[PDB]
Amino acid sequence: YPLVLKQTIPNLSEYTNSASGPLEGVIRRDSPKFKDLVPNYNRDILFRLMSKRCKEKLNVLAYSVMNEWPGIRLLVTESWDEDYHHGQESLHYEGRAVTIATSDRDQSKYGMLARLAVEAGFDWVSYVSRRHIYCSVKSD
């Protein structure tokens, strides 16, 4: 019920066409794809730029979290990347991936957080570290 470190949901390649899929290119301020990116001014969350599907899943997750945690809230540790920190490939480069943690930053918590992630309707998850979890979404 609470996720576990290194778990991958589904137990596949995250790019499996139905889990998250393969990347479709980086987004930079010049690329017209940035025309469609959205920042999350959702003040129940802590930062913002990400995808409309990432938006969907983020906001359906946000308050199920608070139902999971009073006093602790949706903290976005890493939403969108343009300064080349997520390797030669990342959905952070197109505002779809999210490295994620609670507003309280407590390790053994995330296992259950990731759980409600899927319970919100996310497409791919992993307790990919104690420092953070990873979540991702299909091509819109």
């Binding site: 290194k6 778990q7 137990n11 596949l12 139905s18 969907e56 359906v60 919100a120 309707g121």
Partner: protein, 842 residues
């Protein structure tokens, strides 16, 4: 045939034009579907295993997709206000173990320090350190909550020092004294560990590891594939790990290379059949080219995407067919030589036409008509095939006579001795012994008849798991072990049926890829308010309370409603059941968000589903729960009758409702059952398809009828016995085998047909005489063709897979045995009973 004669002549004339131009067309379409289309890959096989287009397809589809349509988006939403404004578990990998000398309860010490060894052998791996996850922030490899660890742990020693001699004893004492002191849980933990098989004489041991369960440990899968870990007393007997569909791919990758092998086998056989290994090159590359060609037909032309690997088998299928016209042809060549070039070619070709044409035609006819199935990979398979077949057909027809001409324009003894002797001794073994083989065969024929049909029917599987490998595999060792244990159970999840109204029910998914389902509609003869309909609601709810399979809080929502209603004021207060529609849906969602935010908060499904049409509300549609007197099983007829009578009464009430309310339907997990019915139905269907097909052809050519009769019977009993052969090795039913069956027809037919033809074609009208002609002039190439087929089949066998080795079986049996069948049985039949002197011709 005039222009046809000119055409034969052009073949006589100007080869390299076509040679090169067709090479061109090939590489063209080849690289087109190569590059434009991507290389389809298989994360897993469990694909297209639905049956869309079924009534149940409508049902499951609207159901699933509506459900993925519920509340995560859309105005469809749960609460009408939500509109408005370190102990282990299966999730860690694990091993199944045992002791294999004295065969005793593992409760003893000998096996304990045997373990100590095995453990220090186990976690000793550095690649393990890779995924070790040394927890505690200590770089300390998080400890195994294991048995000698348990022991030295409630000891104050280090594991393996546990000093069983009395430790073991007092413990077992705790265990019987155990049943639900309570030191932390170790009791109940190691309850999870093993099975009911101790109250003694636990058969197995079992490992957990504080480690991840994924596809990520492949390297370590290998690295323990290297090491047995079974030193003296033991066996790591069933290792349960999620790395399956990966090995799947890799081993297909192994076996294709292994397959080019039997390819080269048949290549050599042919070359030596002529000592011209120029033509062997011609043939093999024609093969691979027709392959790529039909590919481009597949991915690029009708532009298809989903390439179920099972279609791979066409390869080890086609390999047996492409080699027959070969020896069919060479023989005519050598003979007519024994009796300019253009006309000689034209004749021998007038003489091969029927053979090659008809053969390929029946085969690809079966494969094609595979398409009438209710299934995905099936149509994939049949379509792919039919193309590949028809390719090789034209390939030889045209590519090849050039092979001949040019091999010429260029321009041991033991073996002719041998083949001479062969035909001779055979001819005699015939001419001398008349009904021996006949009666023997008829006996065994009706034998396999009773074999298959009466007593040992082809009973189906109910444990599905759709096993993959050798039924002996550690992964498959674990296939049986589960429910013996604790952490295994759904007490059983009783059949929880559900019913719906307010949506339509179809699936406009693209019937080919398993990722196309469409968009769900809405059934709107369905007034969510009208009293007469309301009152049928409530008599309906009444009606199930009366059933035994009625098996017994949002259920029958109306109750919480009228509670909130009759619940007096301080609009929605102190009210009865039949009443307004607008005031109704006006007070309802309030009572509903009420029951929601209450501590009831039943995580549930049956009931309403909302929309903003306060802002205006409504329900789009809504549903009802019920439990069953029955729970989970993979058996057939129990669930069958269950659904049957259930739905029956469903109607019995439905029609009673105001047609306002007959917009609904009924759910369960029959899909399994959906298969276990529709599979056989559609199978038999297609069987009869290809049957009637080959029937039409036989009546087309060998016009006299006795001929096709006797052939039909030969090959039907071949069918019977090959099937009951599968029986002698004792299969459960799956699609694969329905498929190979279907093909059997266009497979076996050709032998019998060549025979009946040559004889109908002979200039003689007597049993023995025309018979002997056809002998001399038909015999061998048949044998060579079935021979290549057996080569390919039988060589898939000492391999890893159900599919491939299964298939080699299918091949070898069917081909060889249908051969013997029409190769002596019918031989006798018309040894004595041929139509002579214009007898029974059309």
């Amino acid at each position: 045939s005039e222009r046809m004669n000119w055409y034969y002549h052009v073949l006589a004339r100007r080869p390299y034009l076509v040679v090169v131009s067709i090479a061109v067309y090939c590489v063209a379409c080849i690289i087109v579907a190569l590059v434009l289309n991507k290389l389809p890959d298989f994360s897993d096989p469990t694909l297209g295993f639905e049956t869309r287009g079924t009534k149940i397809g409508e049902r499951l589809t609207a159901w699933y997709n509506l459900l993925q349509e519920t509340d995560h988006h859309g105005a469809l939403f749960s609460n009408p206000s939500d509109l408005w404004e370190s102990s282990p578990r299966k999730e860690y990998s694990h091993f199944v173990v045992q002791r294999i000398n004295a065969t005793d309860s593992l409760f003893d010490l000998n096996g304990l320090l045997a373990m100590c060894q095995l453990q220090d052998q186990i976690t000793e791996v550095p690649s393990y350190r890779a995924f070790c996850e040394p927890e505690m922030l200590t770089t300390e490899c998080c400890r195994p909550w294991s048995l000698p660890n348990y022991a030295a742990m409630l000891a104050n020693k280090s594991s393996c020092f546990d000093l069983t001699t009395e430790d073991v004893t007092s413990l077992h004492t705790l265990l019987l004294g155990c049943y639900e002191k309570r030191l932390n849980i170790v009791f109940n933990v190691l309850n999870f560990l093993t099975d009911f098989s101790f109250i003694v004489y636990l058969k197995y041991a079992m490992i957990f590891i504080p480690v991840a369960q994924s596809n990520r440990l492949l390297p370590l899968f290998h690295e323990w594939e290297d090491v047995e870990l079974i030193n003296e007393l033991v066996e790591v007997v069933a290792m349960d790990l999620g790395l399956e569909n990966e090995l799947f791919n890799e081993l297909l990758l192994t076996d294709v290379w292994l397959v080019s092998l039997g390819g080269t086998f048949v290549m050599a056989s042919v070359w030596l059949y002529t000592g011209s290994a120029f033509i062997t090159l011609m043939s093999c590359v024609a093969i691979c080219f027709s392959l790529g060609l039909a590919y481009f037909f597949y991915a690029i032309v009708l532009e298809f995407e989903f390439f179920p690997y099972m279609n791979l088998l066409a390869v080890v299928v086609i390999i047996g067919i492409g080699a027959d016209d070969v020896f069919l042809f060479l023989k005519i060549w050598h003979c007519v030589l024994t009796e300019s070039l253009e006309n000689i070619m034209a004749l021998t070709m007038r003489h091969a036409a029927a053979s090659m044409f008809v053969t390929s035609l029946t085969t690809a006819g079966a494969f094609y008509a595979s398409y009438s199935s209710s299934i995905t990979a099936i149509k994939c398979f049949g379509i792919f095939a039919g193309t590949v077949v028809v390719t090789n057909y034209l390939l030889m027809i045209t590519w090849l006579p050039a092979s001949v001409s040019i091999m010429e324009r260029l321009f041991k003894k033991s073996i002719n001795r041998f083949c001479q002797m062969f035909e001779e001794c055979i001819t005699k073994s015939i001419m001398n012994y008349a009904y021996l083989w006949l009666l023997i065969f008829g006996a065994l024929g009706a034998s396999s008849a009773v074999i298959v049909f009466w007593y040992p029917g082809l009973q189906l599987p109910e444990k599905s798991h759709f096993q993959l490998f050798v039924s002996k595999h550690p992964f498959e060792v674990y296939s049986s072990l589960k429910q013996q244990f604790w952490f295994e159970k759904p007490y059983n999840f009783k059949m929880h049926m559900h019913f719906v109204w307010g949506v339509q029910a179809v699936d406009d998914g693209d019937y080919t890829n398993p990722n196309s389902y469409g968009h769900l509609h809405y059934d709107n003869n369905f007034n969510v308010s009208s009293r007469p309909a309301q009152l049928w609601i409530l008599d309906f709810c009444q009606s199930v309370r009366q059933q035994p399979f009625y098996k017994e809080l949002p259920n029958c929502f109306i109750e919480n409603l009228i509670d909130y209603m009759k619940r007096r004021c301080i609009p929605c207060c102190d009210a009865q059941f039949p009443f307004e529609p607008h005031i109704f849906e006006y007070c309802l969602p309030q009572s509903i968000s009420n029951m929601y935010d209450t501590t009831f908060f039943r995580p549930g499904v049956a009931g309403p589903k909302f929309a903003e049409a306060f802002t205006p509300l409504l329900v789009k549609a809504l549903v009802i729960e019920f439990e069953s007197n029955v729970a989970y099983s993979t058996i057939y007829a129990n669930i069958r009758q269950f659904y049957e009578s259930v739905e029956h009464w469903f109607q019995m009430q439905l029609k009673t409702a105001p047609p306002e309310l007959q917009g609904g339907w009924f759910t369960s997990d029959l899909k399994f059952y959906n298969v276990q019915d529709t599979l056989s139905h559609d199978t038999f269907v297609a069987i009869c398809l290809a049957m009637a097909a080959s029937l039409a052809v036989l009546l087309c050519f060998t016009v006299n009828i006795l001929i096709s009769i006797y052939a039909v019977l030969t090959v039907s009993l071949s069918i019977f016995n090959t099937v009951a052969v599968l029986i002698l090795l004792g299969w459960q039913l799956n699609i694969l085998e329905s498929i190979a069956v279907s093909t059997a027809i266009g497979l076996a037919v050709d032998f019998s047909l060549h025979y009946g033809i040559h004889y109908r074609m002979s200039p003689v009208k007597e049993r023995l005489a025309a018979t002997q002609f056809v002998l001399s002039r038909i015999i061998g190439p048949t044998v060579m063709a079935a021979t290549t087929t057996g080569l390919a089949g039988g060589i898939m066998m000492a391999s890893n897979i159900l599919p491939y080795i299964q298939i080699g079986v299918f091949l070898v049996v069917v081909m060889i045995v249908s051969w013997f069948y029409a190769t002596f049985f019918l031989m006798s039949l018309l040894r004595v009973a041929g139509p002579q002197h214009g007898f029974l011709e059309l």
